Write a protein that binds this ligand. Structure first.
Ligand SMILES: N[C@@H](CCC(=O)N[C@@H](CS(=O)(=O)O)C(=O)NCC(=O)O)C(=O)O
Ligand SMILES: N[C@@H](CCC(=O)N[C@@H](CS(=O)(=O)O)C(=O)NCC(=O)O)C(=O)O
Lengths: 209, 209
């Protein structure tokens, strides 16, 4: 530490890391970049891949939101108790990222027309996570193993924004329903989710959700 | 171990993990799924995310090409000396994946109309990797640290298929040219790249490259 998140004034690819840090009792600085500032063209060329988020953990500057999440899971002890669990958490997080990639394309490039067929196809994309939870202690604990991991924070965020897009999307997924309810109730997550910084922040940058 | 890779008969998302296993002196079994067998619809439902690669390591079954690479990186000691190196390697591997996703889209959805544009934009996408090498011992070692890691194999594969796509794309990138030359000369990689198994396997499933 200290931690600084540098990003656009949206939840986007940073709300899962904000929830992880809040639930682990960490504080961080938030360096908000407005679109006017980004468009001045001074900051983007110093970003490794020309994009945000940029994260500073003391000495270390990282780019790539899932690398930042795996770094926080590794350094705060949220990456499993053994290699098998670590491998399974990576498989989960990559499946989360594939669906987030599709979600982002819908929102920014084809919201109005594409929303119907997206929501129609969504049960098939959610079913893998329901299967993983049933295989792990009948769905009563975390997505992998007995303890929370970086992958739980990213899956929770993904499911929370899908419930804003399609309010009944978890009605046929009892373990995912109960999981979202359970994790949202964790004292420091419930507190973060009711915070004005979280609440005032748009999910995406173009108004759609 | 034993190691088994279940995939379609193409290089695609499995050639970097085949080069990693070959270079670490491991043997594995190739279980090949043809496209006509895939289209029958019997195996797809048994895959967690409906997709391949599927990889078996003993009694651990994994999906997602980058979770398989990170697993092999963790279990064979190809993930750095410390936490700061591990995070840098995840940042590199996510940058590779981003460009790999762009390449897959070009190849499968827009080759004849988007190639020229993609190659025009490519230097801007390769320059981050050249900078990363210049920061690491002036580009004379690996992409992160002084030992090869899972991310070197993934970046090596990415650069090799882009030299087929845009011959001469590394011309203005002297450290990446040298890097490809050096890792390609490693005797077990050299052997793998000239094997008929590799040579006779198409890069992509649609015959373009
Ligand atoms: N793979 C990157 C993607 C980052 C990304 O797409 N950044 C966007 C913003 S957002 O989609 O995450 O909101 C960006 O910086 N775009 C600015 C630009 O490209 O100029 C990651 O995971 O961090
Ligand atoms: N994120 C996945 C992507 C896997 C994927 O795209 N698989 C394709 C084959 S390939 O493009 O990787 O060659 C597939 O199974 N397609 C068959 C289908 O979707 O039915 C990974 O990285 O493993």
């Amino acid at each position: 530490p200290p931690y600084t998140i540098v990003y656009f004034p949206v939840r986007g690819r940073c709300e899962a890391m904000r929830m992880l840090l809040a639930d682990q009792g960490q504080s961080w600085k938030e360096e908000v970049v407005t679109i006017d500032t980004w468009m001045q063209g001074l900051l983007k060329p110093t970003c490794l891949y020309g994009q945000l988020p940029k994260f500073e953990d003391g000495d270390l500057t990282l780019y790539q939101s899932n690398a930042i999440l795996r770094h926080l899971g590794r350094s705060l002890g949220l990456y499993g108790k053994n290699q098998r669990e670590a491998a399974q958490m990576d498989m989960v997080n990559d499946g989360v990222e594939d669906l987030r990639g599709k979600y982002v394309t819908l929102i920014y490039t084809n919201y109005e027309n594409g929303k119907n067929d997206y929501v129609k196809a969504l049960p098939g994309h959610l079913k893998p996570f329901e299967t993983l939870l049933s295989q792990n202690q009948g769905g009563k604990a975390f997505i992998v193993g007995d303890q929370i991991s970086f992958a739980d924070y990213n899956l929770l965020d993904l499911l929370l924004i899908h419930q804003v897009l399609a309010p009944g999307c978890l009605d046929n997924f009892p373990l995912l329903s109960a999981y979202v309810a359970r994790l949202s109730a964790r004292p420091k997550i419930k507190a973060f989710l009711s915070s004005p910084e979280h609440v005032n922040r748009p999910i995406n940058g173009n108004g759609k959700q």
